[PDB]
Amino acid sequence: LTFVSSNQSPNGERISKMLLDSNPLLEAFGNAKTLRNDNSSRFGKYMEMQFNAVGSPIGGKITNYLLEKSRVVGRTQGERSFHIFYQMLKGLSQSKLDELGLTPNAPAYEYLKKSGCFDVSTIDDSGEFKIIVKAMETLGLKESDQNSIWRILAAILHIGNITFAEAAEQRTGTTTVKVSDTKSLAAAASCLKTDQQSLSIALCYRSISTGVGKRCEVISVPMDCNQAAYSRDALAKALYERLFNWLVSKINTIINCTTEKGPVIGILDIYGFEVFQNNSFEQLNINFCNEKLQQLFIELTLKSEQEEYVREGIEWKNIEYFNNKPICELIEKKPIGLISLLDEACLIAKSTDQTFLDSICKQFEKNPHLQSYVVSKDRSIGDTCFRLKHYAGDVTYDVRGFLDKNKDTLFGDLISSMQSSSDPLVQGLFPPTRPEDSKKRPETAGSQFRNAMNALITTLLACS
Amino acid sequence: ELDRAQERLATALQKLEEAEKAADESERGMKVIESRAQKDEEKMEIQEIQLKEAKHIAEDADRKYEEV
Amino acid sequence: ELDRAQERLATALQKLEEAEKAADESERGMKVIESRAQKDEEKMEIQEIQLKEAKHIAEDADRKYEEV
Amino acid sequence: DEDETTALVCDNGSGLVKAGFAGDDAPRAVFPSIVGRPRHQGVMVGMGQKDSYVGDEAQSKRGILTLKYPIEHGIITNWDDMEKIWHHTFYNELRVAPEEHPTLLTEAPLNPKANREKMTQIMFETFNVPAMYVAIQAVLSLYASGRTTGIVLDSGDGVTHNVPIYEGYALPHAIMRLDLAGRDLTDYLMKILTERGYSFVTTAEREIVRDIKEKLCYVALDFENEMATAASSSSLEKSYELPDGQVITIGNERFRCPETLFQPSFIGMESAGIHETTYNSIMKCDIDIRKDLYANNVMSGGTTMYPGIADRMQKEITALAPSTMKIKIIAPPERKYSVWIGGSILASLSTFQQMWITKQEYDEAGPSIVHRKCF
Numbered sequence: 021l022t023f024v025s026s027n028q029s030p031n032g033e034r035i036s037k038m039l040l041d042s043n044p045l046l047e048a049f050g051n052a053k054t055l056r057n058d059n060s061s062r063f064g065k066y067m068e069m070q071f072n073a074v075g076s077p078i079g080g081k082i083t084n085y086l087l088e089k090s091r092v093v094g095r096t097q098g099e100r101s102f103h104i105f106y107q108m109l110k111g112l113s114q115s116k117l118d119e120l121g122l123t124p125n126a127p128a129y130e131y132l133k134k135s136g137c138f139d140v141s142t143i144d145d146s147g148e149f150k151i152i153v154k155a156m157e158t159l160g161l162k163e164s165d166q167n168s169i170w171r172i173l174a175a176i177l178h179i180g181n182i183t184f185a186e187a188a189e190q191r192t193g194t195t196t197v198k199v200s201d202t203k204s205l206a207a208a209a210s211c212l213k214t215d216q217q218s219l220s221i222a223l224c225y226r227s228i229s230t231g232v233g234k235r236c237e238v239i240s241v242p243m244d245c246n247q248a249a250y251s252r253d254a255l256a257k258a259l260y261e262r263l264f265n266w267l268v269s270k271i272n273t274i275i276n277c278t279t280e281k282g283p284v285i286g287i288l289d290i291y292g293f294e295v296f297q298n299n300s301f302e303q304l305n306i307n308f309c310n311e312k313l314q315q316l317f318i319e320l321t322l323k324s325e326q327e328e329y330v331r332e333g334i335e336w337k338n339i340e341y342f343n344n345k346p347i348c349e350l351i352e353k354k355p356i357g358l359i360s361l362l363d364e365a366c367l368i369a370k371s372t373d374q375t376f377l378d379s380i381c382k383q384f385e386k387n388p389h390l391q392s393y394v395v396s397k398d399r400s401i402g403d404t405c406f407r408l409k410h411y412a413g414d415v416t417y418d419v420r421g422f423l424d425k426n427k428d429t430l431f432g433d434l435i436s437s438m439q440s441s442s443d444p445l446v447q448g449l450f451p452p453t454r455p456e457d458s459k460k461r462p463e464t465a466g467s468q469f470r471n472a473m474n475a476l477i478t479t480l481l482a483c484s
Numbered sequence: 485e486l487d488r489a490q491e492r493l494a495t496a497l498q499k500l501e502e503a504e505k506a507a508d509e510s511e512r513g514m515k516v517i518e519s520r521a522q523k524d525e526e527k528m529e530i531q532e533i534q535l536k537e538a539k540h541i542a543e544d545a546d547r548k549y550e551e552v
Numbered sequence: 553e554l555d556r557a558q559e560r561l562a563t564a565l566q567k568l569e570e571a572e573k574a575a576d577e578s579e580r581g582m583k584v585i586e587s588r589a590q591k592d593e594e595k596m597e598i599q600e601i602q603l604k605e606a607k608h609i610a611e612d613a614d615r616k617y618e619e620v
Numbered sequence: 621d622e623d624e625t626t627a628l629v630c631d632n633g634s635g636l637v638k639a640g641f642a643g644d645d646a647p648r649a650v651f652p653s654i655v656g657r658p659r660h661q662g663v664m665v666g667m668g669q670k671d672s673y674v675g676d677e678a679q680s681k682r683g684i685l686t687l688k689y690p691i692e693h694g695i696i697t698n699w700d701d702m703e704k705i706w707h708h709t710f711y712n713e714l715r716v717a718p719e720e721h722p723t724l725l726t727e728a729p730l731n732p733k734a735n736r737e738k739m740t741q742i743m744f745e746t747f748n749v750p751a752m753y754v755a756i757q758a759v760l761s762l763y764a765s766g767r768t769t770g771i772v773l774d775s776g777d778g779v780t781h782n783v784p785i786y787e788g789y790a791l792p793h794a795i796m797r798l799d800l801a802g803r804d805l806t807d808y809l810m811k812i813l814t815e816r817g818y819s820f821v822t823t824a825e826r827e828i829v830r831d832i833k834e835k836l837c838y839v840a841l842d843f844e845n846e847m848a849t850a851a852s853s854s855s856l857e858k859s860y861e862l863p864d865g866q867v868i869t870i871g872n873e874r875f876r877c878p879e880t881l882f883q884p885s886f887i888g889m890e891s892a893g894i895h896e897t898t899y900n901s902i903m904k905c906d907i908d909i910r911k912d913l914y915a916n917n918v919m920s921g922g923t924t925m926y927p928g929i930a931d932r933m934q935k936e937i938t939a940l941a942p943s944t945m946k947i948k949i950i951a952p953p954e955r956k957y958s959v960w961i962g963g964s965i966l967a968s969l970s971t972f973q974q975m976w977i978t979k980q981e982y983d984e985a986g987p988s989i990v991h992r993k994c995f
C-alpha cells in the first residue's frame with residue numbers, strides 16, 4: 021500500500037515506523053497461547069486504515085467483538101485466559117500485593133484455581149514483565165497510569181476471592197447464601213468503595229418493582245446456590261467485557277491520530293481452525309464462525325462478483341453452482357432453528373444441557389448435516405455425545421456448559437448497584453448507557469453474540 | 485405582618501425542635517431493634533446448623549437400625 | 553424588624569424541612585427493621601420447635617436402635 | 621430491524637395491568653384497571669370531560685371520579701369500556717402502536733368461549749395486530765422458577781387456580797376456579813370496619829383499603845392461641861396515621877379479614893379451605909404421582925407475600941396427609957411477578973411461532989381460527 025501512495029509524508033511515514041514497533045506491543049494485549057498457536061488472537065478484529073483526499077494514509081481505529089465467554093473461568097490444563105492478569109501478578113512488588121491481600125501465586129486464589137492450570141512451559145511471565153513495561157511506556161502508560169490499571173484487575177481479583185460458603189440455614193432442599201469469610205468479602209467492598217451491607221443485601225437478594233415511575237427495591241427472598249454462583253459469574257463476565265472495550269479505546273486516545281481526517285479502508289483478522297483431544301461447546305461456536313466465514317467468501321468471491329457481470333452490461337447466463345447452502349444459515353436464525361430453539365431451551369431454567377441436546381436429535385436428524393448414535397447406527401458416537409457434519413469434516417462435541425456458559429445474563433438490580441457508584445473507576449466500567457449499540461437491552465448475552473457477528477457480516481457485504 | 489411573622493417563627497422553631505427530637509428518638513429506636521435483629525439473625529443461623537446435624541444423626545441412626 | 557424576622561423565617565423553614573425529612577427517613581428505617589425483626593422472630597420460634605423435634609427424634613431413634 | 625423485532629409482554633388481571641417494552645424481565649408499565657366518569661360534570665368546558673380518567677392519572681385523583689369496574693374476577697360487565705382501557709396501555713405508557721409489534725396476553729383457564737373471539741376481534745378485525753397469543757396464566761411461572769416436577773397454585777387477585785402441572789397439560793383436570801382472592805378481601809374489610817365507627821363505602825375509598833392493607837395486615841400464626849394474647853398491646857395494635865386525616869390502631873382487623881381465605885364460611889359457601897381442595901384435586905390423579913408433589917409445592921402470586929402464609933400450610937397439611945416424603949414449600953424472591961418473569965420468556969422465544977396466530981391464518985379459518993389452533 022505504501023510507496024504506491026507517492027512515498028513522502030511526515031505524518032504518513034510515521035505510522036510505518038510505529039506499526040513496526042507494534043509487533044512487540046500487539047502481542048501483549050489481544051493475544052494468548054493455544055496448544056496449536058502461540059500468537060493466537062482471542063478476539064475478532066476489524067482494523068480500519070484512514071486516508072485523505074489524495075491517497076496517503078493518516079491513521080486508523082479498531083473494533084472488537086463479543087469474544088469467547090468461558091475463557092475467564094474455565095479451560096483445559098495448559099492454556100491461559102488473558103495476559104493482562106498474569107502480567108500484573110509478576111509485576112507489582114510483594115509489598116503492594118500483601119496490602120491488597122494478594123500473593124504471587126494463582127493456585128492460592130479460587131477463580132484462578134477453577135481454571136485448572138497456572139504455569140505454562142513455553143511462556144516466561146516473570147521475565148516478560150520488565151520487557152513489557154518498556155512497551156507500556158512506548159505507547160504512553162507511565163507508572164502513574166500503570167498503577168491505575170492494576171486497581172481494576174485487583175478489583176477483579178477481590179471478586180475472585182469471594183465464594184459462597186453454602187449457608188446451612190435451610191435444613192433440606194433450597195438454601196440461602198451467607199459469607200463466613202467476611203475478610204475476603206469486605207476486601208472487595210473496601211476497594212469498590214461501596215456499602216458492604218447494601219452490597220450483600222442487593223446482590224444476594226434481587227430487587228424488582230420498576231413501574232415506569234422507576235422502581236422501589238429491597239423486596240426479595242433467598243435462592244439456591246447454583247443461581248447465586250451463576251449470577252456471581254455473570255457479574256465478573258460483564259465487567260471484563262466492558263473493560264476490554266473501554267480499555268483499548270482509551271489506549272488509542274494517546275495513539276489514534278487527531279491531526280488528520282478522512283475515509284477508511286478495512287482489514288479483517290480472526291481466530292483460526294483448531295482441533296483438540298476433546299471438543300466441546302467452545303469448538304461449536306468457533307466452527308460456526310467458519311461456516312459464516314465460508315459463506316462470506318461465497319457471498320463475495322462467488323455471488324457478488326457474478327451480479328457485477330450482469331450489471332456491467334455483459335451477456336451472462338446463470339451457470340450451475342453448487343448449493344448456496346442457505347439451509348445451514350436459516351436453520352439458526354429465523355423462527356424454528358438451532359439457536360432459535362436453543363434460546364427457547366435456555367430460558368427454561370430447568371431444561372438442562374442434556375434436555376436441550378435431546379431437542380436437537382428429534383427436531384432434526386432429518387435436515388442435512390447432522391448425526392448421532394440413535395439414528396446413525398455407529399458405535400463411534402457416544403451416548404453422552406453427538407455427531408455434527410460440517411462443510412466436509414466430521415466433529416463430535418460435548419454438551420457440558422452450553423446454557424449457563426452462553427447465557428451470561430445480568431439484569432438491573434445487580435448492575436444498578438454498580439452504576440450508581442461515585443468512584444470514577446467503577447462507574448467507568450459502566451459507560452453512560454449503550455455506546456453506539458442500543459436497540460433493545462435485556463435479552464441475554466448469548467443471543468447478543470449472534471447479533472455481534474450478524475452486525476459484522478452486514479457491514480462486510482456493503483463494501484469492495 | 486410582623487405579628488404574623490413572629491407567630492410563624494414561634495410555631496416553626498418549636499416544630500423544628502420536635503422534628504429533630506423525633507429524628508433522634510426514631511434513630512434511637514432503630515438502633516436498639518437493629519442490634520436485637522442482628523443477635524437473632526446470628527442465633528437463627530447457629531440453631532439451623534445444629535438442625536442439620538440433628539437430622540443427619542437421626543437419619544444415620546435409622547440407616548444404622550435397618551442394618552441391625 | 554419585619555425584614556429581619558422574614559429573613560429568620562426563611563432559614564427557619566429550611567431547617568424545618570430538613571429536620572422533618574431526616575425524621576421521615578429515620579422513622580421509615582425503624583419501621584422496616586422492626587418488620588424484619590418480627591419476621592425473624594417468628595422464623596426463630598417455628599424453627600426452635602423443629603430443632604427440638606430433630607433432637608428428640610434422634611434420641612428416640614437411638615433408643616429404638618438399642619432395643620433391636 | 622436487523623436483529624430486533626420487539627415483542628410486547630402483557631399480563632392483565634383484576635388488580636394491575638403488567639406491561640413492558642421488549643425482552644424485559646420485570647413489568648415496566650403498570651396501572652390499575654379502572655375507568656369511570658365525572659359524577660361531578662368535568663367543569664365540562666375546563667375539558668369536555670371524556671377520558672374516564674385512567675392510568676396513573678385516574679388513581680392520582682380519585683375522589684371526583686365515579687370509578688366503575690369492568691372486569692370482576694372473570695366476567696366482564698361491559699366490553700365497550702375495555703376499548704378505552706387498552707387505549708392507555710400501548711399509547712400512553714408504552715408509547716408504541718399495536719400496528720407494528722406483536723402482542724402477548726394471559727389466559728384464565730376455563731374462560732367463556734364467547735370471550736375468545738370477542739377479544740381477538742378487537743385486535744385483528746379492528747386494530748391491526750400482525751401476530752398475538754394468549755398464554756395460560758400458571759404454566760408460565762413453572763419454567764421461569766426452574767421447576768419441572770411441581771403443583772402450582774397461582775393466585776394474584778382475580779381467581780384461585782389449583783394447577784397440578786408438573787409434566788404436561790390438558791389431562792382430566794385436577795384444576796379448580798374459585799372467586800376468593802384480593803378484591804374479595806378489599807370488600808370484606810369495610811363490612812367489619814362498621815363495628816368501629818369506620819365505613820369506607822364507595823369505590824374511591826375502597827381503593828385506599830388496598831393501600832393500608834399491604835403495609836400492616838398479616839395472617840395470625842394461630843387465631844386460637846393469639847386470642848388470649850390480644851390482651852397484650854404490643855404485637856396486635858399497630859398505629860397507622862391515615863395520610864388523609866385519621867388514626868386507626870388496627871389490631872384485630874388485620875387477621876380477621878384474611879381468615880376468610882381458610883374459612884369460606886365467612887362468605888356463604890360450602891367450599892372448604894384451600895388445603896382441602898388440594899387433596900380433592902390430587903386424589904383424582906395417579907397413585908404414584910403424589911410423593912413428588914408434596915416434595916415441592918409452587919405457591920405464586922401476591923397472596924403469598926403476606927406474612928404468615930407459608931408456615932401455616934406446613935402445619936395443617938402434615939397433620940392429615942401422607943407423611944413419608946419431605947414437605948417443602950417454594951416461595952421465589954418475588955413470587956408475585958413470577959408470572960411476568962415467565963411471560964417475558966415465551967415472548968422472546970422463536971419456537972413460539974408454531975403456536976401463535978398470524979395475520980393470514982385468521983382469514984384462512986375464519987373467526988374459529990382460535991379454537992382451531994389453540995385449546
Ligand SMILES: Nc1ncnc2c1ncn2[C@@H]1O[C@H](COP(=O)(O)OP(=O)(O)O)[C@@H](O)[C@H]1O
Nearest residue numbers: 633634635636776777778834921922925926956
Ligand atoms: N408485598 C406484598 N404483600 C402483600 N400483598 C402484596 C404485596 N405486593 C403486592 N401485593 C398485592 O398483590 C395484589 C396484586 O397482585 P397481582 O398478582 O399483580 O394481581 P392480579 O394479577 O390479579 O392483578 C394487590 O392486591 C397488591 O396489594
Ligand SMILES: [Ca+2]
Nearest residue numbers: 775776921959
Ligand atoms: Ca398472578
